[PDB]
Design a protein around this ligand. Sequence first.
Ligand SMILES: COc1ccc(-n2c(CCN3C(=O)c4ccccc4C3=O)nc3ccccc3c2=O)cc1
Ligand SMILES: [Mg+2]
Ligand SMILES: [Zn+2]
Length: 313
Amino acid sequence: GLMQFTLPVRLCKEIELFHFDIGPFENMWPGIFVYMVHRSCGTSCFELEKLCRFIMSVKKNYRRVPYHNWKHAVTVAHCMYAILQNNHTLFTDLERKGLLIACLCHDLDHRGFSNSYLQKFDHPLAALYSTSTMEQHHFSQTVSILQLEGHNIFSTLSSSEYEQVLEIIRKAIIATDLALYFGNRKQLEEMYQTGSLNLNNQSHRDRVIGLMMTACDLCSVTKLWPVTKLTANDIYAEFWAEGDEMKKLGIQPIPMMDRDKKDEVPQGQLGFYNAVAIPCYTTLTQILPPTEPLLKACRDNLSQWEKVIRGEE
Ligand SMILES: COc1ccc(-n2c(CCN3C(=O)c4ccccc4C3=O)nc3ccccc3c2=O)cc1
Ligand SMILES: [Mg+2]
Ligand SMILES: [Zn+2]
């Protein structure tokens, strides 16, 4: 009960910042995650023994893929921690519990392949889940781990609170399907501008939590340039592998997944910042002003990509 996690001074201070990188020491990531739960949620939110056993079973069920790996899970959960800590009073007790867990679990058992590759391959999961294929799988894996003996971290919630938290987590994980982001942000844009946005409207909270999950999931674009630049290598390492697998199915992949078109990456990054990232953090900043540093860091990285195209790096 009186057992706190404590980080070295540099990490204690930098973990509070949006652009924090969790570093290359894998054995510290569980401790970083528990530290964020204790500060974000309370030292009483979860039984430590159960949380530790939940964390290590989640870790075990992430795969050795270049990008959609255990490091991504913890990185995305840190961004959520930064949003929640900078917006103290806006989120319920259940929501703080649910969203950090949702982030840790959001890409469980990812194979490094998009929903589109699963469908073109005719993967069994494409028959089981026709839309948001991988995201329904990620939620399924989350419930499976919660039902392992000794792993139910929500045990001391009431029947109704338990149903509420799994519903928060399900919506949160489904919302990480980027195909669903565009419509969710368009609706949030209209609600914010016509002034109809109402954080007591549950359907509105869902939309706002959905956008938070997009923002955390894309947070690679909100780090300092050297982290962003090096993470891009891992992202494209997966896309190019999917591209190769498209070619094996006798389908020319989109340039984004075609390793023969590396030259086109700098311009594709501009398109992605302009079409996805900047709009995402802009709308998020309007709804939640204290998330402005995500938008500023994103704009900084857009400028860095424009310098790459101008041969300046
Ligand atoms: C829909 O708007 C888009 C979509 C894709 C693109 N796009 C991209 C963006 C790549 N990208 C994701 O998709 C993504 C998802 C999640 C995290 C990080 C990322 C991330 O870095 N790269 C290219 C590279 C070369 C050639 C072409 C393209 C191309 O068209 C541009 C605009
Ligand atoms: Mg995902
Ligand atoms: Zn993800």
